[PDB]
Amino acid sequence: SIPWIDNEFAYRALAHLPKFTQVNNSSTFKLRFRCPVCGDSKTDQNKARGWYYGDNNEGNIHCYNCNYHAPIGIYLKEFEPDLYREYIFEIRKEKGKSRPIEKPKELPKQPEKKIIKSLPSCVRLDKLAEDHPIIKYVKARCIPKDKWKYLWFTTEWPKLVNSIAPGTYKKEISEPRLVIPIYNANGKAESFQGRALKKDAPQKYITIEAYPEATKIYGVERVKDGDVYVLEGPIDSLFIENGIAITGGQLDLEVVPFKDRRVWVLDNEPRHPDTIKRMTKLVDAGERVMFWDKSPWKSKDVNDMIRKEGATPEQIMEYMKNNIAQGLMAKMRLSKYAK
RNA sequence: GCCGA
DNA sequence: TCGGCTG
Ligand SMILES: [Zn+2]
């Protein structure tokens, strides 16, 4: 197929639809739109199920509301027949020549641009008093005290974010959050994650990037020699020596350093199918994956194993150091672990 | 539609 | 009340 013409004609034929948004991340071309087949919902205008994915070799229009998965050409056949002809002409026109997309291959990225020198309205946890509610809450979270120099507490999290990235929220309503600054390899903060307090925060638990090319891996600056253990939680990574944590829904293996010695230590969730998909895609890369198949504790994450089943960190490090598998042995491990 | 806040 | 989610 011809993906760039799919993206171009999808942008042409979906821009005039209501609630259109050109969601383009650095490898993914997606279009969000109200689906004209079903209309989505009057309440769910912003929650528009009309989705186009052009990052694949074929461009697919999948709407989850009316269950309408279709290529862009079928959409043009049903709705834009002038654009469909033009499409049929242009595809057989461009079949003869070679792809020219590679010719203007440039990058508009940048290095460290919004380097976070200070955190206004934030007090670090080690300089906070021992009877502070955030201090009592992290006492309930059982984080060791010596790492309390890595976490801040705020009450003005929208004001703090708008001090760094203005215009994120129209209202700076005061909100207590746990600031986890995510530093690069050289030790300076490139982002910060606003961890929800109490049972949950009101709204918008989001990692705030200083710039779109900033790191999403917390604790890279604290990596010493030995095997590097990757985790899903920054607080979960705080119980781990040489423990880093990816902060984001996208899991790029290339942006994670230590390719020789990274260890994937994910959640203990066998019933969860996306979890099985994550390890799967990790073992398909031939990577070193840590397996929860012989865990004496049955909680979800390492902090949970500590809080809810009374686990100590030394048992945790010996369990990860005794259960790194790779290759077909790991594949059989995931196999027997999955169900 | 499912999940997260 | 929002975004992101395969077929
Ligand atoms: Zn629809």
Residue numbers in the entry: 3 to 341
Q: What's the paper's own text on this?
A:
The gp61 primase is composed of an N-terminal ZBD and a C-terminal RPD that are linked by an 18-residue flexible loop. Here we report a series of cryo-EM structures of T4 primosome assembly intermediates.
Therefore, we utilized an inactive gp41 helicase mutant with an E227Q substitution in the walker-B motif that abolished the ATP-hydrolysis activity, and assembled a T4 primosome with the WT gp61 primase and the ssDNA/RNA primer substrate. We separately refined the helicase and primase regions to improve the resolution. The gp61 primase region achieved ~4.0 Å local resolution where the pentaribonucleotide primer was observed to form a short hybrid duplex with the template DNA that was absent in the WT primosome map. The RNA primer density was just enough to accommodate five ribonucleotides, consistent with the RNA primer provided. The 5-nt RNA primer extends from the gp61 ZBD to the NTL of the gp61 RPD. The primer 5’-triphosphate group is stabilized by Arg51 in the gp61 ZBD loop region; similar to the interaction observed in the T7 gp4 ZBD–ssDNA/RNA primer structure. In the gp61 RPD, the RNA primer binds to the NTL and displaces the ssDNA bound there in the WT primosome structure. The 3’-end of the primer is stabilized by the β-hairpin of the gp61 RPD. Interestingly, the 3′-OH of the primer has passed over the catalytic site in the mutant structure, such that no additional ribonucleotides can be added in this configuration. Indeed, we found that the linker loop stretched and became ordered in the mutant T4 primosome bound to a completed 5-nt RNA primer, as compared to the disordered linker loop in the ssDNA template-bound WT primosome.
